Amino acid sequence: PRYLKGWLKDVVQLSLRRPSFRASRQRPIISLNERILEFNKRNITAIIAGYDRKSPSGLDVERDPIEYSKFMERYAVGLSITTEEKYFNGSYETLRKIASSVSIPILMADFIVKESQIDDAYNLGADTVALIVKILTERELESLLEYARSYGMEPLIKINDENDLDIALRIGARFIGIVSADWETLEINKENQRKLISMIPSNVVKVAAFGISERNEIEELRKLGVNAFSIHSSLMRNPEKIKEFIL
Template identity: 55%
Template sequence: MPRYLEGWLADVVKISLNRERINKIRERPIYLLSKFIKSVTNKNAIIAEFKRKSPSGLNENRNLEEYVKFMEESGAIGISVLTEEKYFGGSYSDLEKAAKIVKIPILMKDFIVTEKQIDTAFNLGADAILLIVKILTERELINLYEYARNLGLEAIVEVTDENDLKIALRYDFNIIGVNARNLSSLEVNIRNVGKILEMIPKDRIKIAESGIKNKEDIVELKKYGADAFLIGTTLMKDPNKIKELI
């Protein structure tokens, strides 16, 4: 593992390797995130994230059921649920509860490094997973992507810099997320997102992630080709912000 992933990120990856597989029968149909994003007209495609805390200082104790219902009713086209426990306070239980409530795509947001995590995402009702280029080898990225697709799940392939993007563009990944947060320093730089979004071909779905605080940020990111916006901290602090962001 590269040196810049030492510390908390390396720690969370090790924890992910030991996560237990959840074996349950999936009853929820699969809602394709790509179709929901493409169907958006005359508004912004918002993926509202539920997370209880984050290394950057967030610490909210919101009711998950109320939050996801409100986001769906307010027009969000997807829900992202943090399931990583140590640093984000998430749980598989949160994912399972959300899947029983909403009828829009659900993203399992975690540091996915094993097929058993993808099995769990499928079994608990997730429709998409996150694959972070920075923490996977190229072979791992391809294998996990194909494994998810064989289950019918979509995958957001997340990049944070040009080197990540070069890897992602070697393959036919249809959804690419650009994270404004540097995974090593945790600093957020939205300008960097615009720069990378411009490099992504128009035939890919492009999602801007992290650091979005207001409508102006969204307008700016759309100039660079963003098709959807994954927003966590801003909405967790003030759920009513969804109305002005959409």
């Protein structure tokens, strides 16, 4: 990975050490990005509903992940399941249980820095993963992008500034997440958002991520060309808001 400091470095060191999970996938790949395109064509608001047991910024929601997913399965274009253990209280076994329980696309939300974690996602039933430009060298990015593609996954490339975007297009990303967060503190930061989204090629499926809590935010972003919306925290705290977000 790249030179890093603080909590982000720590989670990356953790992820480098993550042992591989023994499992055989009993479910086909259900393309998240293609299902986003079908929602777009059918005029249905595409929400990617996230499950986080905890977050490093102090989210702590006990909430059964199976019932949460089956509920979200009715309204969501896809699920985003965080499997990172230390800061998010996630697990591989939670993802496996949910993957057996739902027939919509699942993105494994973790800090991917090695091929083994892509084997894991695949073997556990995930349909895709995200790759973070801030933590990966462009050579690691290129390598992991091809590795995921060889499994039939189109990964979401997560960017949060103009340099990240330049790298994502260089590697030929077709599935981009615009993260409106400061990586150091995980405070919402929507300064770059509207200008980053305006730079993205129209043939790339764009996902807005982080700090989305209102339908107005979603509506404004749909007019700016955003294809889908990743929402974690607001939905963990109030699962019924999914019925508002798709209005």
